Design a protein around this ligand. Structure first.
Ligand SMILES: Nc1nc(SCCCN2CCCCC2)nc2sc3c(c12)CC[C@H](c1ccccc1)C3
Ligand SMILES: Nc1nc(SCCCN2CCCCC2)nc2sc3c(c12)CC[C@H](c1ccccc1)C3
Ligand SMILES: Nc1nc(SCCCN2CCCCC2)nc2sc3c(c12)CC[C@H](c1ccccc1)C3
Ligand SMILES: Nc1nc(SCCCN2CCCCC2)nc2sc3c(c12)CC[C@H](c1ccccc1)C3
Ligand SMILES: [Mg+2]
Ligand SMILES: [Mg+2]
Ligand SMILES: [Mg+2]
Ligand SMILES: [Mg+2]
Ligand code: NA
Ligand code: NA
Ligand code: NA
Ligand code: NA
Ligand code: NA
Ligand code: NA
Ligand code: NA
Ligand code: NA
Ligand code: NA
Ligand code: NA
Ligand code: NA
Ligand code: NA
Ligand code: NA
Ligand code: NA
Ligand code: NA
Ligand code: NA
Lengths: 396, 396, 396, 396
């Protein structure tokens, strides 16, 4: 049970473990696209003897954070331990090796999507974005008088084949990801993947259509089994006009009873309707998880609310260092100190605060975050809060 | 079709319309309790000829708002138009008469619970609190190391008959409602009602038990039909210790598979567990709706975030006045002006901002709230935000 | 295993068999009401030794038939064989004894409601009325421009307690039953029963409300478990105005999603809406079954279509006689003959034709009704057809 | 937003709109077959600028009507407005253009199948045939003694591959459609389509088998997901012998629990069984919709009941002309008149009466059809009634 960097000879074993470990796994032809995002020495396998009983890797990602600042991000993925090799400490060993390589390579943060919500806390990962399913009963949906783009003249939205407007989607997404906390750069090979899933699979998924606006798009398909349900896989709007326009078009799908979308908690859709309740929240889950690899690098890199005035404190991260934190003019200076701590928290908790999705006051009430000054709690709450609401880019 | 204040002769007709209009309606013996909360001239009926084809009334309530400030509040309730008299403008007429009486009596705000989410916007009501159902699969629930009250020695929580500890619940609730935006004073007659529903109804609801802590309580009953489900009707905790303690006790209901509760979006429960995901959000709806009856009275009465620095603007409420608004040191001065408006919004939108449940930025993205300065949007967002998260007290 | 007329000593045994045989059975206090409709010598029991292992009885009813003609009708009911005494020929024996008494008493027809649709054919009973469940999704329901009673001024429909308007319901029903094929005289004791079921049963059925028009009524209750469903137990309208008015009022139940009613196939409701499809047919079953006890008495008593011109034929009923049938001016003369038969049918088939619910052509296509002249089939079809569509009165 | 006849360049745009608008749409290879049924100038598109935002066309059909009379029929189909271009009056404009072309080409009637039941009334379409799903629990099904084809010797029904007996199905259908109101000529290209759907689609529909009798056939497949359910897609019987024989064979599918079929309300199947109730009605919907394009041409072309004696009246169709209508010897003479109207109805209502599926008395009770003489209502009822019951041929 030795821990190694896989050779090309190990790939067959990794794809087997992958197929047995993840049901979504397409197979080794879609694995070519994602493989380009794994750097040399981004992967560990555990051999037994020999076959692969454990694997883990990270991908080179670019994550947008508050202040429209883009961080290099180790994206953890393809983590699996063989059913034959459970409770053998293989995840603890593989995670420790990758976290060393990630740290030593100069990534300030790592990120993942969680298969279960109880595994990644103990390795310093905090859920940092919230997914929110909205289901609209579109038979009752009337837009509010105040809603944009409900006047006379033409619609600026077009029904299109996705695959004939790759360039326009690319441009819109590229604007979207640079401007929104949670945004990831989506490279060419993943657009290649996305448009392959846009066409109908025999005995599988239906044709995906696209609604295209100058400043936004929505990809949608009718559900396999429920033929009165449209699933919006992805809606990217750069402007409020684009967002409203696209939803006017989705509510225009007169053959559907229900439109469903995985969105963020601050999605303005409910406020576009006369009856806010018509956009029911049907599902809520953790999206992206962050591990802050370097506390001073990460805290310094992101912007903070200009509204809160200058303040200073000492933050202790459990087995992660003690820092003099000074915030003002929406910049932070974060420097080593042995002064008495005013705030303590595990490293997972900082991940959860970092993109503004969770309030420090809420984590305080759960005692995940200790402080004796309720004024300092208010100031952290206000400082770490994000002007642009945090969204989830794409699963990896 | 004349609009009148009901006499005692009209009550029979109102109870008939009530039974035909609301399925929850107990009947005329529970109506005695609530009747004490309706002031003289708090009710209108519409007679035809004669029987009652329309009714509406308000109750004298005390609503807690940010800054632990308690407003007199007209609580709108018992609104019904006979199925025989729809689309006859009876609601518009009854609502207009009560809003006059409410305004002329010196209530700064009115409030209601909505049977449908598409009726009350046009009468100036904005949804102001969010209800959040959490269902915990308690078979998997382990508390986090950081969680309070998981040490050796005795538990401070007691399993009790609710009806033998009315005094203690009263005291705890009274502390709770004074300290939390959305809180209502609960008078004696409504405690009398609440403890009557605590005992088992033949072929109806099961016995309610109580978990009692010095600084908190939870009332729960097993669901009628699903015997592995506990429904927490009401959990009031004044301290984080009390909140965690009470949930340690609820997760200790080893004969249940699932605990369900209607709570608020900032409930710290998910953060008390090692697996945040075990507290699934199963349901989300508008709770309390506000109509701001007097804009300057209401804006001046509530506290604002101390973090945001002093700023001034002109707010226009559609057919509701234009005001010079100056906010600083968490107080607002709100005075008449004919200066050019920097923010416009319908009166319903102000209701939605008032308790801090909805961000001005979110309503802006839906164009419910117009401004050309994105800096002013950030400042409103920050100012109107509530330190103590807004909760929902009790339905009326 | 002797076959007898029950004494008062036998009642306990009959109520036991009743409770074990029919789940709807209230118990011996509701049995007092119906007992008044059973004539002396209207009941048979089978004793074993002793306890009651078999029972059957008939009630004295008045059935309206085409031409607004009212026939004395033996209503068969309370038929049960003990689970301990199946496949012992007890039903064949009890049915034969009652059919003798019914025949010898001068009833031209007997009738029943069937617990299963495969038992009563062999005893000469034919299904004669069709039940039709309509479920309206009332959220989408808009009345057609052409629909009556959608103008300005007051509604003539009232929401009422059923029990305070017994006299008005009685009068309306009495007009209804005299004018409609399938109508039964409803005696006082059954109105006493009906209004007892109008009030709420603890852990059972909800309060019944009434919609009252000068020329019609509807009794409705909200469903026990599904609180967005209204069940219309009974709607009697004497005029089209009344029928439309009452449905305008039912569609006005704005707190319900769905109105359901058991009605007849020719119910005009679908044609009152802009979208006929909103009144979905959710359920269809045989209602009232007829056994023609005396072929010439029954054929002569009912009216026939005036449209079809005079024609003559020979009808043979299998083990029921051969008759010269002459129809014209909507009267029939039916007299013994030994002339060659032109139409043969079992006695059950005549029951099915008798109220106009089933076309002779349809039963011909199934070869339940033999003839070699397709012209004679058209003439029977046209003659037996009912101008007023056949409805179902009440179960017994 | 100009309204044009599409060129071959427009087809790509029409197939896109088709795929986004109808979920059943196969794709552009099945579109070749149906395209042969669209005449030159049978289609309109609406371009925006450009892409297709609206389309509609009619197909040249031959509809059988009462009296075994075959009318040329514009079959309306492929109607779609882009989700981006709702509430823009595009359907009203496209429908008006096609109705002009249909009228000017000398079609006496147009017809369609409705995606929703609330759209086509306002364009003069009335639902003219009723679809009726019968589900048989075939485990309980015993044929009645009176049923044909239950004697000794061989069965005349064969289990066959559909595709090896195209000629025999064609011949039987051709006899069926000529003899039955609602019948459509089915051209070669649609038989080509039908037998392509008879073979198994990978991850889709199962193999279709055929039961073949000299004078009838049934196509059936086992349901994709429910393997104890047989779906009879199509059963055509020319004789009662054939109809009973084929059902004896379907009830012989001993591995199925349930046989389901979409049939007509007068289907004799229930009367072939000892228990009529075993054929439950599980579903009812409008089938074919008629717009009478020329009132005198249509009324004169169809046969009428010989049973009703000669009578004369004045019919007014709302914005459709006033006519002296004289009916006798099952022919109608229909001529212009300015005499006072005795019957008024919208044009949609005439469509509903035309094939005999709806009684004039029923539409009268809904006030869709006004007259002050109840005798004239009886005469229309009787005259328009169809000897052969009206069926639905095939969806288009
Ligand atoms: N990261 C990936 N994602 C996806 S789809 C994302 C949805 C799953 N998601 C993840 C869990 C939770 C929520 C849903 N597919 C693929 S294939 C593939 C990778 C990968 C990683 C690199 C790998 C490899 C292995 C050996 C040698 C070279 C490269 C091949
Ligand atoms: N406000 C009330 N609430 C309740 S339970 C609350 C739950 C309903 N809720 C409301 C809708 C949305 C969500 C659920 N019960 C009662 S009874 C009663 C009142 C009343 C008001 C006063 C009234 C009256 C009438 C005529 C004369 C004198 C007094 C009698
Ligand atoms: N006919 C009755 N109906 C009903 S409710 C009808 C619904 C049942 N229906 C019937 C089956 C199919 C469909 C639903 N309840 C009652 S109680 C009662 C009778 C009876 C008959 C007379 C009997 C008796 C016995 C011994 C001595 C004296 C009198 C007492
Ligand atoms: N009429 C058709 N039906 C069907 S399947 C019927 C079931 C749908 N039905 C309809 C709605 C309600 C109930 C189910 N498929 C096809 S493809 C096709 C047509 C068409 C029409 C002609 C068209 C075209 C377009 C542009 C250029 C040339 C030709 C191509
Ligand atoms: Mg975050
Ligand atoms: Mg609020
Ligand atoms: Mg009948
Ligand atoms: Mg018809
Ligand atoms: Na596509
Ligand atoms: Na998609
Ligand atoms: Na709303
Ligand atoms: Na500060
Ligand atoms: Na108790
Ligand atoms: Na409770
Ligand atoms: Na977690
Ligand atoms: Na400021
Ligand atoms: Na009542
Ligand atoms: Na009822
Ligand atoms: Na319709
Ligand atoms: Na005749
Ligand atoms: Na086959
Ligand atoms: Na088939
Ligand atoms: Na039967
Ligand atoms: Na006549």
């Amino acid at each position: 049970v030795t821990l190694c960097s896989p050779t090309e000879d190990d790939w067959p074993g990794m794809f087997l473990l992958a197929a047995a470990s993840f049901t979504d796994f397409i197979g080794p032809e879609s694995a070519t696209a994602w493989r380009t995002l794994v750097p040399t020495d981004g992967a560990v396998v555990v051999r037994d003897g020999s076959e692969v009983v454990g694997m883990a890797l990270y991908m080179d990602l670019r994550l947008t954070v508050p202040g429209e600042v883009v961080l290099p991000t180790a994206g953890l993925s393809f983590v699996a331990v063989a059913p034959t090799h459970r409770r053998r400490g293989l995840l603890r060993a593989m995670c420790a090796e990758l976290h060393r390589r990630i740290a030593d390579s100069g990534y300030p943060v790592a990120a993942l999507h969680a298969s279960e919500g109880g595994i990644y806390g103990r390795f310093g990962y905090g859920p940092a974005t919230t997914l929110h399913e909205l289901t609209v009963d579109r038979r009752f949906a009337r837009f509010h008088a105040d809603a944009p783009g409900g006047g006379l003249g033409g619609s600026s939205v077009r029904l299109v084949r996705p695959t004939e407007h790759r360039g326009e989607f690319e441009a819109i997404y590229e604007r979207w990801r640079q401007q929104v906390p949670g945004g990831l750069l989506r490279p060419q090979v993943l657009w290649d993947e996305l448009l392959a899933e846009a066409k109908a699979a025999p005995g599988g998924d239906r044709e995906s259509f696209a609604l295209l606006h100058p400043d936004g798009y929505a990809l949608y398909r009718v559900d396999r089994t429920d033929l009165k349900l449209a699933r919006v896989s992805e809606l990217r709007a750069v402007t409020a006009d684009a967002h409203c326009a696209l939803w006017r078009a989705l509510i225009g799908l007169d053959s559907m009873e229900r439109i469903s979308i995985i969105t963020h908690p601050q999605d303005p859709l409910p406020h576009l309707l006369t009856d806010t309740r018509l956009a029911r929240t049907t599902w809520r889950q953790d999206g992206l998880w962050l591990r802050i690899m370097n506390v001073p690098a990460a805290l310094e890199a992101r912007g903070y609310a200009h509204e809160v005035g200058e303040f200073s404190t000492v933050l202790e991260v459990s087995d992660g260092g003690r820092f003099a934190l000074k915030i003002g003019d929406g910049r932070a200076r974060c420097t080593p100190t042995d002064a008495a701590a005013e705030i303590e928290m595990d490293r997972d908790v900082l991940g959860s605060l970092y993109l503004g999705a969770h309030r420090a006051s809420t984590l305080a009430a759960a005692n995940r975050l200790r402080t004796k000054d309720s004024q300092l709690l208010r100031r952290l709450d206000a400082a770490f809060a994000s002007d642009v609401p945090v969204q989830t880019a794409f699963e990896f």
